[PDB]
């Protein structure tokens, strides 16, 4: 690939050399590997969580009875995780002869955690066994060692999904970076009270952003677009879960 | 391009391989192809379609006693039509030499159908020339004989421009991948009512989203944000292509 | 990367040549050298300019008694240069060695202009020093120059950032290429009136489009929509640039 021509930069005035930490050289050749394998789609879709969002904060005292902050990672986690086992071709890896498909019978789901030192992609196992709590409490364990530098590339391995919310920063969506050898990422951006057409007025209906990424040599547009249209349609009634 | 580490996945559970069909694979082998040449933006813009679609409605029995179902899918077939007229530079292909584009003068259209054995783009010819009925008659017969393995190579070639549509399955916007050689492709996804300013108060009003991507060394940021203009402004008074 | 074959054209109708221009020729250089070594993203943001837009209608007689007339561009530019000078990894640049940044302590910024001739992008110096109106009579006689073939390369080298604004023809969203040595470019387009929730009922706002691409190797994704978080901030309050 051409490189880019450098520049004497000092030419138009002042400069300041500040270098990259180990973690960020490691992070920009993983993405730029990710980047020119990997023929990116971003499917965007929003779901309704007015429902969801009532409940997570009538839990609030039980889960501050088990010592736990329950926010909405948890209820993304468990919602992807039934939706990888229900559409597998978004849990599954391309195989290295490029001729098939390996699917995976187990959903560990990574999220993004942007630390100091740069970003770090901790993994949450058999996320389709644990409860809303047991999310609550591992994800916030395992983004604590992330930031405190004791987490162990144990907990970095083998994941079959990523997570990747700003919502609490701030923004409408944005086009995430498949994680390769990972097939697809959801990105999650914030929520905002929004009109939504019921058949006759528009109602005021709390919508959260997603922008599903995916890797089309695998995933097709429709797949994708079925993949974000059922996760609204779990966020939008998570009992659906249950049967 | 630096190759992706193969991983044991089955360190972390139990896998299984499927192999991709050929067809996957051919899919596969463009997709990545196109992604390395062509430097990709995408566009983005809503169209009024309210009356488009009354008028749509109205037409049902028309169209059912030509036996043909008049979906979306021609009257932005028609409207495409037009536009690559209009603005030629969309209608062309970069020549070989990098230093030259070829401009076509005959309008061909394909349009993505996602089958069970991968994703074929059947092409109709001279999408200028044939009637809302005619488009509406030929796009679902190639729709079935491509579902059905009957679609030949011949029915697959010399295309200028793609429509790839999955308002039928749901979703906001989406960043499709220019099928090289041509220059753009117009992603369609799933209307909603939306309140829309008139200069005074909000009429709810019946949108379309387009998602416009475009090879950006032959297509610059102005020439197509004109483009998904136009066609927004054409697919709110149809009757336009009539002067 | 593997090439795109080569087409008969001719063979599905009648095609023309037309060359491409010099410009056209290093755009087209310059955007594919990018595409390939930058990972992009894409962060998108609304940003309220209600008052910011009053504001710059009531300045009119000011700015036509100064002779120049007061476009968003320069609001854009003063709020941009205040955050690049806020956020400083945004004003920076990757070392050759992969393993620096170097970061400028200067705050130039190039706007694209698209020309006849192809795209030029002429640069602002030092546009934290100058005023509202002294940006708005730069812009524009740069502009000029541009479009009339008398810019000097001098006018094109050495910028930070780069805006880039379809605001004057439309759409809703767009995902600009990063021109590279830089990190990010901010896209700008149409601002709609759009009802906003105010904690009780909706109220029409003006919002303006932000769609800010940056190189992901540098900069993080909390980063990026922390950028676009502030400048929605400063452009809803732009006397928070005064203190
Ligand atoms: C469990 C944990 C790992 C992730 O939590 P989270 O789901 O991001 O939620 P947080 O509590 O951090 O978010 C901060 C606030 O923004 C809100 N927020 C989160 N997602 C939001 C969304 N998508 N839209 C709008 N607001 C949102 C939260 O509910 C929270 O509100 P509060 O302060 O009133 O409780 C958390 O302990 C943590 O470490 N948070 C830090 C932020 C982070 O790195 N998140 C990464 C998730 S991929
Ligand atoms: C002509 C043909 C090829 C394409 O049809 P189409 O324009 O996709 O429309 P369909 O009838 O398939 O769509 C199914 C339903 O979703 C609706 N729909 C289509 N586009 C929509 C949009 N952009 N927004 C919202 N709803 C939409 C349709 O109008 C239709 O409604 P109905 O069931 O009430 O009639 C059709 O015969 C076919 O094969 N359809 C299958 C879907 C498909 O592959 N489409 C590819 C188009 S690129
Ligand atoms: C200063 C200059 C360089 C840029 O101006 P600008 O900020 O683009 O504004 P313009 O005056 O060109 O825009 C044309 C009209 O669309 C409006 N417009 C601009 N941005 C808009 C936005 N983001 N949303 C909605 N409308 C917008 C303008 O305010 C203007 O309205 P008017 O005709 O009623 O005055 C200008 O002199 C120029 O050369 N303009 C030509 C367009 C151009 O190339 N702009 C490039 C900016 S990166
Ligand atoms: N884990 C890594 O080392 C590479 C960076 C992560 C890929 C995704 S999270 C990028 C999101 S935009
Ligand atoms: N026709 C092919 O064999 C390649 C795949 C099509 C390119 C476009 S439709 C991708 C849309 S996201
Ligand atoms: N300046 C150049 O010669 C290259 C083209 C500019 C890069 C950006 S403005 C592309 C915006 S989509």
Redesign the pocket.
């Given at each position: 690939i051409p490189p880019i021509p450098p520049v004497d930069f000092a030419k138009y005035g002042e400069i300041e050399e500040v270098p990259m930490t180990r973690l960020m050289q490691i992070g920009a050749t993983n993405l730029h590997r990710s980047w020119l394998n990997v023929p990116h789609v971003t499917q965007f879709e929003s779901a309704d969580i007015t429902e969801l969002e009532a409940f997570r904060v009538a839990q609030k005292a039980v889960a501050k009875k088990a010592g736990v902050?329950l926010?909405?990672?948890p209820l993304l986690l468990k919602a992807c995780a039934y939706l990888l086992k229900e559409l597998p071709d978004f849990n599954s890896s391309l195989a290295p002869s490029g001729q098939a498909l390996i699917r995976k019978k187990y959903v560990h789901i990574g999220?993004?955690?942007?630390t100091p030192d740069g970003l770090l992609v901790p993994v949450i196992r058999n996320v389709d066994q644990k409860s809303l709590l047991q999310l609550?409490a591992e994800?916030?364990e395992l983004?604590?060692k992330a930031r405190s530098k004791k987490l162990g590339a144990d907990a970095m391995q083998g994941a079959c999904f990523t997570?990747?919310?700003l919502?609490?920063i701030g923004g409408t969506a944005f086009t995430p970076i498949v994680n390769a050898p990972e097939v697809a990422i959801l990105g999650?951006?914030?929520?905002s009270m929004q009109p939504v057409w019921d058949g006759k007025a528009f109602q005021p209906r709390l919508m959260?952003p997603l922008s599903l990424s995916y890797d089309h040599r695998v995933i097709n547009g429709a797949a994708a677009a079925r993949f974000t249209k059922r996760l609204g349609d779990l966020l939008a009634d998570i009992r659906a879960i249950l049967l």
């Open positions: 902050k926010t909405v990672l999220f993004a955690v942007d609550a994800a916030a983004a604590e997570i990747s919310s919502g609490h999650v951006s914030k929520a959260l």
